[PDB]
From a paper:
We purified the endogenous NDH-1L from the thermophilic cyanobacterium Thermosynechococcus elongatus BP-1 using a native polyhistidine tag on subunit NdhF1. Mass spectrometric analysis suggested that the amount of NdhV in the purified complex appeared to be substantially less than that of NdhS, which has a similar molecular weight as NdhV. This observation is in accordance with previous data that NdhV is a transiently associated subunit of NDH-121. We determined the cryo-EM structure of the NDH-1L complex at 3.6-Å resolution, which indeed lacks the NdhV subunit. Hereafter, we will refer to this complex as NDH-1LΔV. The first hint of the chemical identity of β-carotene was from the yellow color of the purified NDH-1LΔV complex revealed by the clear native-polyacrylamide gel electrophoresis (CN-PAGE) analysis. Absorption spectrum of the excised yellow band from the gel showed the characteristic absorption peaks of β-carotene, further confirming the presence of β-carotene in the purified NDH-1LΔV complex from T. elongatus thylakoid membranes. Given that we purified the endogenous NDH-1LΔV complex from T. elongatus thylakoid membranes with a mild detergent (digitonin), the lipids we found in the NDH-1L structure are very likely physiologically relevant and reflect their actual binding positions in NDH-1L in vivo, suggesting that lipids in NDH-1L may play important roles as lipids found in other photosynthesis complexes of cyanobacteria. To further examine the function of NdhV, we used the M55 (the ΔndhB strain of Synechocystis 6803) mutant thylakoid membranes that exhibit a complete loss of the Fd-dependent PQ reduction activity due to the lack of functional NDH-1 complexes. This activity can be partially restored when supplemented with purified T. elongatus NDH-1LΔV and can be further alleviated by addition of purified T. elongatus NdhV.
Among them, cyclic electron transfer around photosystem I (PSI CET) is an important mechanism that balances the ATP/NADPH ratio required for the Calvin–Benson cycle and reduces the ROS production. The NDH-1 complex is a key component of this pathway in most photosynthetic organisms and its inactivation leads to growth defects and even cell death under environmental stresses. Previous studies strongly suggest that, together with Fd, the NDH-1M module constitutes a key portion of the PSI CET pathway—electrons donated by photoreduced Fd are transferred to PQ via the chain of three conserved [4Fe-4S] clusters, corresponding to previously identified N6a, N6b, and N2 clusters in respiratory complex I19 (Fd-N6a-N6b-N2-PQ).
Author numbering:
A (entry chain A): 5 to 234, 238 to 372
B (entry chain C): 12 to 132
C (entry chain H): 2 to 79
D (entry chain E): 1 to 101
E (entry chain B): 2 to 493
F (entry chain G): 2 to 192
G (entry chain I): 3 to 49
The structure:
Amino acid sequence: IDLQGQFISALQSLGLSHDLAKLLWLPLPMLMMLIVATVGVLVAVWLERKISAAVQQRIGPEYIGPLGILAPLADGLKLIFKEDVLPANSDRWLFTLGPAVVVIPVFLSYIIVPFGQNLLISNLAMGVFLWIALSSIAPIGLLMAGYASNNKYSLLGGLRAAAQSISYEIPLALAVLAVAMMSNGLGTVEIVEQQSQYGILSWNVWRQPIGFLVFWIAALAECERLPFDLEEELVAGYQTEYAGMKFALFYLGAYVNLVLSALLVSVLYFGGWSFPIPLETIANLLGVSETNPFLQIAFAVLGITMTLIKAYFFVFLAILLRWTVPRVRIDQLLDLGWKFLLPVGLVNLLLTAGLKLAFPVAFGG
Amino acid sequence: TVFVLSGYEYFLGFLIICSLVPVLALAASALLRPKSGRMIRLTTYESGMEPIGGAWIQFNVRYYMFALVFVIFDVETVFLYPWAVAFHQLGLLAFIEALIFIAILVVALVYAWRKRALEWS
Amino acid sequence: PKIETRTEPMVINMGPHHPSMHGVLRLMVTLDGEDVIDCEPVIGYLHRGMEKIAENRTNIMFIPYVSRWDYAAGMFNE
Amino acid sequence: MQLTYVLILAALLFCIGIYGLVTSRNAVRVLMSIELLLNAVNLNLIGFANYLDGQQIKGQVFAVFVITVAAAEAAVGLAIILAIYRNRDTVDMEKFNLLKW
Amino acid sequence: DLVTLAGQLNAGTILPETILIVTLLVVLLADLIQGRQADRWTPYFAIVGLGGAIATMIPLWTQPATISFFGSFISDHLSLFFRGLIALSALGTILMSIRYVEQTGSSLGEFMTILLTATVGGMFIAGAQELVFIFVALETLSIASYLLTGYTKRDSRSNEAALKYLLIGAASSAIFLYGSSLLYGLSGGHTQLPAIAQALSSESLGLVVALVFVIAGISFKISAVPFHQWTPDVYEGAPTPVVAFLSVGSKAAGFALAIRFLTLAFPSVTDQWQLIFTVLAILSMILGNVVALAQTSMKRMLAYSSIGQAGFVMIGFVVGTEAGYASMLFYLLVYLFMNLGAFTCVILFSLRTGTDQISEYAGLYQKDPLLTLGLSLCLLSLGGIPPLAGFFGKIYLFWAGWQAGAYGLVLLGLLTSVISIYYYIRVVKMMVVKEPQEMSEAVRNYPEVSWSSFGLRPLQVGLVMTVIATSLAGILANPLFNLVNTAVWDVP
Amino acid sequence: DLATLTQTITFFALAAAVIIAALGVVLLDNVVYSAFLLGGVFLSIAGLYILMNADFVSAAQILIYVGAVNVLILFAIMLVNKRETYTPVPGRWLRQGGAAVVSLGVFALLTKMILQTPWQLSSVPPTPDSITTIGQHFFSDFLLPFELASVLLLMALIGAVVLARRELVLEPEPILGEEVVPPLELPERPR
Amino acid sequence: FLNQITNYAKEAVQSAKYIGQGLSVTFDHMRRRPITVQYPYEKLIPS
Ligand SMILES: CCCCCCCCCCCCCCCCCC(=O)OC[C@H](CO[C@@H]1O[C@H](CO[C@H]2O[C@H](CO)[C@H](O)[C@H](O)[C@H]2O)[C@H](O)[C@H](O)[C@H]1O)OC(=O)CCCCCCCCCCCCCCCCC
Ligand SMILES: CCCCCCCCCCCCCCCCCC(=O)OC[C@H](CO[C@@H]1O[C@H](CO[C@H]2O[C@H](CO)[C@H](O)[C@H](O)[C@H]2O)[C@H](O)[C@H](O)[C@H]1O)OC(=O)CCCCCCCCCCCCCCCCC
Ligand SMILES: CCCCCCCCCCCCCCCC(=O)OC[C@H](COP(=O)(O)OC[C@@H](O)CO)OC(=O)CCCCCCCCCCCCCCC
Ligand SMILES: CCCCCCCCCCCCCCCC(=O)OC[C@H](COP(=O)(O)OC[C@@H](O)CO)OC(=O)CCCCCCCCCCCCCCC
Ligand SMILES: CCCCCCCCCCCCCCCC(=O)OC[C@H](COP(=O)(O)OC[C@@H](O)CO)OC(=O)CCCCCCCCCCCCCCC
Ligand SMILES: CCCCCCCCCCCCCCCC(=O)OC[C@H](COP(=O)(O)OC[C@@H](O)CO)OC(=O)CCCCCCCCCCCCCCC
Ligand SMILES: CCCCCCCCCCCCCCCC(=O)OC[C@H](COP(=O)(O)OC[C@@H](O)CO)OC(=O)CCCCCCCCCCCCCCC
Ligand SMILES: CC1=C(/C=C/C(C)=C/C=C/C(C)=C/C=C/C=C(C)/C=C/C=C(C)/C=C/C2=C(C)CCCC2(C)C)C(C)(C)CCC1
Ligand SMILES: CC1=C(C/C=C(\C)CCC[C@H](C)CCC[C@H](C)CCCC(C)C)C(=O)c2ccccc2C1=O
């Protein structure tokens, strides 16, 4: 089936000019992905709060709804009603647009992640470039907000957080390179197709086990899960200067980055829209599956369900390992990063190239 | 010339939609303010007292050196992208020359690691 | 904003809030980078004048004061 | 969309970079206009590889090499600049009048 | 590996550059592992590697001229001669820098890494057929000369000159890169210069604009009259072995790039830039040999003498005969040894005394006769005394200029040489003529007439070898003219 | 008809943004404002590279000239920050007028060169990919600059590490001559 | 020099085993019921 082709045929049967009819079709999924992203953010805030309560043997937020699920919605509806306060400095537009410069590209990078063969936005050539080069912008907004903060401690904390953030970009690119060499492509569709050709025996987690751990450590260092940079040299790193609106924007941006990383790690290594049993055997066992959509709709729902359970598993593992491993210093974190993830990533790329040039049978060829 | 590619209207439309929403949320927060802005006594954030020390930062080199090694390895990663892209029918001499490139940059990393090029003591 | 980075030692004034578990103490830390050179402690935000309380007070009227001397155990002063 | 408007924009960016190389009221804006002067020739090479070149593209390769060269030149220039603040007290270019005839 | 891909790659005309790269890697590894206590075998190992790189060009000399890396590098006798010239410059720079760097205070291996990098860049730019390869090698030499200027570690003169040199070099590199992009856009899309020069016979104004925009960045490297505004400030504040390398190696690299690029790119518009080169030489020789009469600093005097003597080489490039470039190839070969001796004597006089003012030069006939003897025998060769080789170069230069039909250029060159001999003889007048109880201070207490401390013997024997070479090249130059003339007929 | 119309509209808007931001870099009397407008110049020229044909070159443009070069520029700006009063020089108006007429003459000469020299436009469709051919050209035509860029970046990193060291140690050299040389200085002493 | 590398590898595998034991006791802590009280639904008995 094709909903876009049927909508185009219905608008042609109504009578139009085939250009303005096709122009306005894109904003409805372009807003639907945004509203389900805010739905996932409101899911993840309640999930993190209740799982942090269940780890420390207590109950999360209650007496707000049925079980307190409206509490992220109540927080997001209350924090936009607070009085926007400003410090005694200049450049008010810079202080306003700093968090805007932070919030724009991480929200913009939603055109990369897929949910199936057709349930995605853009897969042109190089979606990993459009993730990395857009995620490497937020230090500029962080330094801009630190300069407009007008403080001696918050500016130093913003400098330390920017130096922590820019160091974990190079193994984050090398772990992408180690998979893009084997997949001979930069788009996520070919990467997930080379994993969905076979079942469990074609997963990239068993082919590149060191690169998955390097990418996971780099993601946990980039989304500020284990580095506590929010006791940061007087009280906090880049805080204690904004109002409820800018703090809410930073909180939702951090949760968007966490959700996007938890989706992208599974997509690049484990693989959403996949099954342990191949779909061709089930399609041959059931009947004829080439035009009948009654099984294809259920297969698309099952692929969305597999992507959602993988994202929920990675989110639960990240927020379980937040309070499991103890807090380490940012100097020790930068030292372990630059002394571990770069050399083992380089020799992992070298052994990946050697295994691809030695036996090009089970790899991408 | 003609502009034919895989598509770029989604990127521009999503940029327009994602750039229209933060200033709209800021305008809504300014509209639903309790009274107004323009606080009568504007004070910066100090923990418990008045500013008694000074507005100066000690001259350091650790941030600039980290960003220097970051840009030096980023322009290496940029050159390392298309070799890994075009490694499907190219051969083994390109792998040898990329191994020489990787070994030269590993020698550069060893030179940066041995001396005091990055040290947050 | 006026943040002029110079080549002078930075005086860090830790406020008397300490919002983790500590009370009132104004710590002035003088340093020149990633170390600590000088430290000045300033107190006087919790002094209640207990010695003036016991000037005109008997033994049966001094028990809650002497228990509120130290708020960790208290029974050692009693 | 024609090549002539892109060439006119590249020439105007080159003249803006020339003026910001001459006056600049600073020493970091000199390098910031040097990046504009090289981004003008990057626009020139990208437009030439878009319009004149066909299948075998090489102006994009030259633009990538020019970008890497300008990043290395920016690193060398900032390494030159950051020693002047350690040695001298001021940052103004007009105060450097020691090496006379 | 495959034999067909290795035969189609033709990586056999690259071996001394790979030997120098391996030598750079071994020097960097020895500096990283051992440290500062291994500063007694590393420059001798680099000298051995430079000799092994310059000795393996003899099987490369008797070889047919083939292209390599799919029409990217061209190997001829001219490129081998320029590579040997750059290697002989670098070995003398090492021999003059061994004591000077350790007397400055920095580590020697970190300087020798950038010196070998500049040597590899010069050896790569001695060929440089491809346009992007020309830009990469030129910016490699430019970044090398940037980083070799600020070596004094917060001494004010070098870091005050390095920013001006960075500004002027970045402006010239932007102008040359805009001209290179224009020259790429004028053709159909080709990058190889025989493929570019075939479709450029239309006589457009954009060809002239691109020629001026390329020759501006070229003449910045040659340092002719309209771009000589960096060198009198650069040559004083920079350290002396750095400027001793930059006065000959970068100049020969710019001359080789100018010759090869103009020959392989413009065999149609030669008369348009011949008049420009006559104007540049006429202004440059006059401005150098008139400005250099009034300067009181010795290093600035040699700096302006470099500009005054760089204009004589342009007279051989103005003409179109086959004997014109042979004059430049002989004059650069003489000028290498002349500038090497004139820099070694200044390095010795500045390391044994301190500052090197002109009026301090009195009282050298009694303290050290060998130093003033070498300085006199080198400055007389720089002046044009007929027992020495500089006169033998200038006679061939004026003969080629009068044979091709340039009378006024030879007349102005003779007039500027007659003017320039007055300040060329002034250092000898301060040295060997001044009587006792006339010299200035800090001359009467010379403690170190003997050299026995930390490798002063290679610095002495390099000056001895330079003096013997510039004394024997004047009366005995019969194979040198044949070796020059056998590498000039290949240029069309 | 509509797609070319919106492409020309976005091209004219990006060109106007280039002009106003390049004016705001060199005319505003603040360094951080010129740095942020230079970042806006980088984003606008990245969109202009996206518009015509460039995807990988535009991605490298975004990555380098946003995440590394502009961040290092902002680091050098925030490191060198001190309040000083710019003294009035005796002559600046004639220098600014000379720079203005040089820029105007260069612009007029380049405009005459563009309008005089014609160009040969091609009528062939471009390739749908732009990473495969350039990835093939790094080992067939342009082979030696691929390693000379690495040697150049090695030399630049070595020189920047040398120029960026703190040099906390202090050790005097043995005397060689009459005047003692200070550590990490020049033997050529001024008068 | 190799003994320091083996000691670093032993410290790394010991840190990995400590991280695994922390994950094990964290997964163990999810089995027990919460021991808190509700207010004003489960008020304490005054002695
Ligand atoms: C812990 C974290 C938790 C996370 C949160 C979990 C809780 C939330 C989970 C919710 C599920 C997540 C969101 C689902 C995945 C995103 C799917 C999506 O975005 O998916 C986007 C989809 C579009 O996707 C696919 O798009 C296709 C078009 O693709 C084309 O376009 C695509 C680009 O859009 C690609 O380029 C693709 O290659 C190209 O072919 C077709 O439209 C397919 O039908 C469609 O499935 O948007 C649409 O669904 C269309 C938009 C609605 C339009 C309404 C339909 C129009 C009305 C038609 C009525 C017809 C009436 C006449 C009837 C005739 C009567 C006789
Ligand atoms: C008071 C307020 C009221 C609000 C009113 C709003 C009502 C309307 C919104 C309700 C949405 C919920 C209803 C569920 C609709 C799900 C339809 C579906 O998935 O429709 C499926 C179709 C299938 O799409 C077609 O599917 C085809 C078959 O492919 C599928 O099969 C292939 C097999 O190899 C491949 O795997 C391929 O990737 C996979 O997509 C092709 O892909 C075509 O391109 C594409 O058109 O998707 C489509 O068109 C796109 C449909 C987008 C739906 C995404 C919503 C998320 C799904 C709900 C979450 C699952 C919940 C299920 C709960 C059940 C619990 C037991
Ligand atoms: C909720 C409502 C919100 C409002 C809705 C949003 C409306 C937004 C889009 C309008 C819909 C109609 C137009 C789309 C429909 C449309 O007509 O597009 C289609 C058009 C051409 O597409 P195709 O070539 O596929 O179409 C023709 C083919 O069918 C055959 O040739 O796409 C483009 O022109 C891409 C333009 C991208 C241009 C390059 C990107 C520029 C990015 C610049 C980045 C700048 C950064 C700046 C930083 C300072
Ligand atoms: C980290 C350390 C890096 C140090 C540099 C590494 C050197 C390793 C290889 C040596 C290069 C020379 C090989 C010639 C030595 C030699 O003559 O070998 C012989 C052969 C060339 O033979 P010809 O085909 O010229 O045959 C000559 C005969 O016909 C005459 O009998 O070379 C090869 O087989 C080429 C393949 C080597 C592998 C590819 C090397 C070329 C790429 C290397 C990078 C080149 C640019 C370097 C400068 C930037
Ligand atoms: C066309 C003209 C070309 C001419 C070039 C000249 C070529 C010959 C130059 C040789 C003179 C240099 C040695 C004299 C120096 C000399 O005689 O003095 C000995 C020299 C100085 O030692 P000291 O006396 O300082 O020793 C320490 C003292 O404190 C204890 O007495 O020590 C050496 O052994 C240095 C190591 C030389 C190592 C030589 C290289 C090792 C072999 C390398 C194999 C290389 C393969 C190629 C590279 C991959
Ligand atoms: C191998 C292929 C390349 C060869 C090219 C030749 C380069 C030039 C020669 C340098 C080799 C090393 C000499 C180092 C010299 C060396 O290391 O010291 C050898 C020795 C000085 O050291 P002693 O052994 O006296 O010192 C022992 C110490 O322990 C006392 O402190 O003899 C000297 O007096 C040399 C005097 C300079 C004499 C220079 C003469 C150069 C030859 C000129 C031939 C002229 C022919 C003229 C015809 C008219
Ligand atoms: C099914 C998928 C399961 C994937 C789970 C893996 C995600 C765990 C990543 C750890 C995040 C925290 C990193 C903090 C790590 C931390 O803070 O300590 C790191 C610690 C640093 O120790 P030091 O500070 O002593 O070391 C530096 C000093 O030695 C300076 O000389 O040692 C490491 O460098 C070794 C790292 C091994 C790390 C191993 C991690 C994986 C352990 C779990 C293995 C699971 C196997 C599962 C098989 C089913
Ligand atoms: C068909 C279907 C369905 C179903 C579903 C399902 C069946 C699901 C399930 C599944 C699941 C339910 C999932 C989840 C999971 C999660 C988890 C469970 C996680 C956690 C864990 C962790 C993270 C841990 C860790 C660790 C490690 C790694 C080491 C050792 C130790 C431990 C183990 C602790 C529904 C109804 C929806 C609808 C649609 C369709
Ligand atoms: C290192 C050292 C040596 C060893 C140095 C010796 C081997 C001389 C080295 C000279 C080199 C070999 C000269 C190289 C010759 C070149 C071929 C010349 C070509 C360049 C010219 C154009 C100048 C001594 O002989 C010595 C003697 C007395 C006291 C101290 C020392 C001392 O410290």
